[PDB]
Design a protein around this ligand. Structure first.
Ligand SMILES: [Mg+2]
Ligand SMILES: [Zn+2]
Ligand SMILES: [Zn+2]
Ligand SMILES: [Zn+2]
Lengths: 66, 56, 113, 56, 142, 51, 84, 263, 45
């Protein structure tokens, strides 16, 4: 669906770093380097951000129901 | 398992035949509670390194 | 399969939607907790209540007549726990001893030397 | 299918779970199951107050 | 079709014995393994003669018999419940009446007895024969 | 040109309408691009033929 | 004819588990149906507990009719059967 | 007798050190800061209309996890303690969100900055969503295509993390003691050598390493704890520490009052 | 009557239990009931 607001394990806010992560990945930065630059130390937040799949765009591709 | 297991002649069988089913159930509960608390405050785990042997 | 698969228990009303069982009665029932479903029947008379309490009670079914040996025993973590508990090099400090002694329902209130 | 075995009333069925804090002869029953199932108790001078409270 | 959970293999409190497992309540509160559930109910009108057909309408005790014991106040004038309305079990979601050969009797389909949720979508169309055809999709959270 | 019957059409087969359709029009027709086809639709139910 | 004299009884003088359960259930039901109690009641309210107290003191007014396979029967009072 | 040493400090997190205290005191402080520090969070969502692809409960759950400024939440009153019907101005904060996509092309991203604090218990500094910077977009809430509108009225109340994890003021509290295992409180699993196979703790240089010829001290007790508290922005780290201490003190005072009244 | 939307052009219209099940301009046979105007509460938990 969309990026979760908080990390499932600890509860750190990760819902505001999706755009920054995509921007960092766009400019050739590696995933680990981007995660380090996002100040994500514990690997729980690292797997929260790294393993997220953005399915919201696929749903948005459909025509509005109303 | 040789003592508090389900085998014959063990602690459970002796306690049953000596005291009664009520005392046997009480023993079950007491042992479970004490050992569970000790394991809670001690800890136990398994890992991949337990399946790895040395070079020799 | 046998008479130990159907036993009389005492009701304790608890929240959530799962039946709660002691870990020592899983082996006679041949049950685990990976999605097993189990059934409960309520007697509706005093005579059948007495029959269940005096004939089919769980403590009366500890020893089975199939092999004159118990069918309920200390199993799973508790078993492993006692193997780590009764080792020769296991020592317990005073406060933990007091907590463990208080954890015993049948404790007589006397702290051993 | 109807004489040797049959479907019966006053029965429940649900998933089981473990509980180290229970006695050997104790079963945990959910609130909804305990409320749905019932037992008919007679009215005597020894339990009149409890039964009236339960009715209320 | 899954999530990466931080698993610790340990004997913590004896509540994970015999294939059981302990889940973090705070993780559950944060949306871990939360899911949706959609259920669809289908209905249509059947022809029983030249002019003996079922009707999708809100039934009343004055002109309809054999009414269910559920709630009929959640229906509209067309016999169909509006989407986005919270509904409990044993409630009427589609109201259909059929004439007798009080000239009509109730044939409305209610919600499942042990199921609650929110009406997500309502679809109305026509079948091969030419009568009405309704599908009500309800959504709940597990 | 005598009509003899109606043959059910397997989805994403050469005689289906979803072969040459591009991504935009597939989204327009409320059809998931990740769908693979290989099944029939009978009375609104998806049916698959086991080998 | 089918009865067996008291001096010719050959069955065990002990109370079996099935007999004990049946007597306890019958006595509990009778007590719940407002029957006279032959023992004092201090604090117990469960009819089963009252029946058990009566059984311990050997005051239950019931007779067990044990049936031999041929058809003859032996009558044993609840006050003369040994209770463990 | 208790001493506090602060190693690092910033509005998001404090890494500090406690000494001359019992282990239970530090553990209770950590638990209280984790679960028993009241904050302000959205607990009631009124959806006037929602045409987005996301479900209503999905958006409500997403809105409930958005941190809000709870600087003056102590002066606020609980909903249960309040004598008003439903909710009033001094027991809740009302937020309004209205989003719509303009044009037939593109996707409009709705963030947490679109929430407007229409009313609240003035002039208390509560209710406003937390912003990392003055120009920070905030937490991404939803995405909207053309002819898709969101109209939400949210009610924020005061609560603790015991009821729900959304009121938790802190994310994760790192807590450790005895980096050199002098007290022998743990046994180290190893294959060849235990010292080589186990990485050193980040506070290993703070304590002197044990000498090889040293004898075990059976009377030693844990007396030096290193703990790092990280917050979600709803409260400052120092505020979280102070309010956890105050909550523990209030709980002990309540127990003392109950004991006094029991006579 | 109550509001209805079309499944093709997303056009809003109304029916009075007498008109056939059709769109007003494109003649689509698939229509949906519009979302009710009543506000609904949510626990957001
Ligand atoms: Mg199984
Ligand atoms: Zn995390
Ligand atoms: Zn108020
Ligand atoms: Zn249309």
């Amino acid at each position: 669906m969309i990026i979760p607001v908080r990390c499932f394990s600890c509860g750190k806010v990760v819902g505001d770093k999706w755009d920054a992560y995509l921007r960092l990945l766009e400019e050739g930065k590696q995933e680990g380097d981007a995660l380090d630059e996002l100040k994500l130390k514990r690997y729980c937040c690292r797997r929260m951000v790294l393993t997220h799949v953005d399915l919201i765009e696929k749903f948005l591709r459909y025509n509005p129901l109303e | 398992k040789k003592t508090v297991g389900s085998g014959g002649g063990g602690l459970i069988h002796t306690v049953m035949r000596e005291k009664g089913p009520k005392i046997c159930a009480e023993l079950f509960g007491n042992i479970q509670k004490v050992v569970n608390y000790w394991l809670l405050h001690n800890g136990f785990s398994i890992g991949i390194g337990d399946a790895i042997a040395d070079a020799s | 399969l046998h008479k130990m698969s159907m036993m009389a228990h005492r009701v304790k009303v608890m929240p959530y939607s799962t039946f709660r069982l002691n870990l020592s009665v899983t082996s006679p029932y041949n049950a685990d907790f990976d999605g097993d479903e189990m059934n409960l029947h309520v007697p509706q008379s005093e005579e059948t209540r007495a029959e269940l309490s005096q004939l089919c009670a769980v403590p009366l079914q500890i020893v089975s007549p199939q092999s004159n040996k118990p069918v309920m025993g200390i199993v799973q973590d508790t078993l492993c726990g006692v193997r780590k508990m009764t080792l020769r090099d296991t020592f317990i400090e005073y406060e933990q001893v007091m907590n463990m002694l208080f954890w015993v329902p049948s404790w007589d209130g006397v702290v051993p030397q | 299918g109807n004489l040797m075995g049959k479907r019966v009333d006053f029965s429940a069925r649900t998933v089981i779970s473990g509980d180290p804090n229970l006695e050997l002869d104790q079963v945990g029953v959910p609130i909804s199951i305990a409320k749905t199932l019932s037992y008919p108790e007679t009215v005597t001078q020894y339990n009149i107050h409890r039964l009236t409270e339960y009715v209320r | 079709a899954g999530q990466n959970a931080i698993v610790a293999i340990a004997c913590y409190s004896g509540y994970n014995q015999e294939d059981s497992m302990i889940m973090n309540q705070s993780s559950i509160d944060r949306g871990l393994f939360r899911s949706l559930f959609f259920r669809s109910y289908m209905d249509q009108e059947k022809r029983f003669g030249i002019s003996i057909v079922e009707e999708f309408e809100k039934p009343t005790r004055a002109t309809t018999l054999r009414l269910k014991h559920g709630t009929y106040e959640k229906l509209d004038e067309d016999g169909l419940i509006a989407p986005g309305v919270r509904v409990s079990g044993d409630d009427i979601i589609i109201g259909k009446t059929t004439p007798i050969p009080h000239t009509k009797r109730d044939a409305s389909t209610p919600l499942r007895s042990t199921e609650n949720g929110i009406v997500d979508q309502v679809l109305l169309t026509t079948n091969q024969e030419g009568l009405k055809f309704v599908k009500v999709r309800m959504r709940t959270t597990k | 040109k005598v009509h003899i019957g109606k043959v059910p059409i397997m989805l994403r087969s050469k005689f289906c309408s979803l072969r040459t359709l591009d991504e935009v029009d597939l989204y327009k027709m409320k059809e998931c691009p990740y769908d693979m086809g290989g099944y029939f639709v009978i009375n609104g139910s998806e049916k698959v033929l086991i080998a | 004819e089918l009865a067996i004299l008291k001096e010719e009884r050959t069955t065990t003088p002990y109370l079996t588990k099935y007999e004990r359960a049946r007597i306890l259930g019958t006595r509990a039901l009778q007590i719940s149906m407002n029957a006279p109690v032959l023992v004092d009641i201090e604090g117990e309210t469960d009819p089963l507990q009252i029946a058990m107290k009566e059984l311990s003191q050997r005051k239950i007014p019931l007779v067990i009719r044990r049936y031999l396979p041929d058809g003859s029967y032996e009558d044993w009072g609840c006050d003369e059967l040994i209770v463990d | 007798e208790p001493k506090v040493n602060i190693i690092n400090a910033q509005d998001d997190e404090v890494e500090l050190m406690l000494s001359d205290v019992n282990l239970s005191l530090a553990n209770s402080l950590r638990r209280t800061m984790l679960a028993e520090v009241p904050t302000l969070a959205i607990d009631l969502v009124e959806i006037k209309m929602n045409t987005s692809v996301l479900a209503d409960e999905f958006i409500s759950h997403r809105l409930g996890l958005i941190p809000l400024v709870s600087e003056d939440v102590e002066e606020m009153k609980y909903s249960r303690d309040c004598t008003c019907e439903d909710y009033c101005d001094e027991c809740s904060v009302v937020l309004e969100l209205s989003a719509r996509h303009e044009g037939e092309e593109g996707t409009t991203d709705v963030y947490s900055s679109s929430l407007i604090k229409v009313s609240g218990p003035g002039n208390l500094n509560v209710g406003e969503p937390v912003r990392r910077d003055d120009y920070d977009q905030g937490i991404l809430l939803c995405k909207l295509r053309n002819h898709q509108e969101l109209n939400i009225r949210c009610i924020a109340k005061k609560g603790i993390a015991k009821e729900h994890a959304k009121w938790s003021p802190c994310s994760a509290i790192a807590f450790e003691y005895d980096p050199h295992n002098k007290l022998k409180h743990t046994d180290f699993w190893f294959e060849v050598d235990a010292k080589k196979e186990w990485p050193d703790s980040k506070y290993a240089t703070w304590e002197e390493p044990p000498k090889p010829g040293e004898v075990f001290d059976y009377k030693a007790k844990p007396n030096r704890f290193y703990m790092t508290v990280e917050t979600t922005g709803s409260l400052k780290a120092n505020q979280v520490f102070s309010r956890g201490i105050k909550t523990l003190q209030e709980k002990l005072a309540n127990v003392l009052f109950e004991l006094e009244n029991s006579r | 009557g109550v509001k209805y939307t079309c499944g093709a052009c997303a056009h809003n219209f109304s029916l009075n239990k007498s008109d056939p099940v059709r769109c007003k301009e494109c003649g689509h046979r698939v229509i949906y009931k519009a979302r009710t105007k009543r506000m609904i509460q949510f626990d957001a938990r």
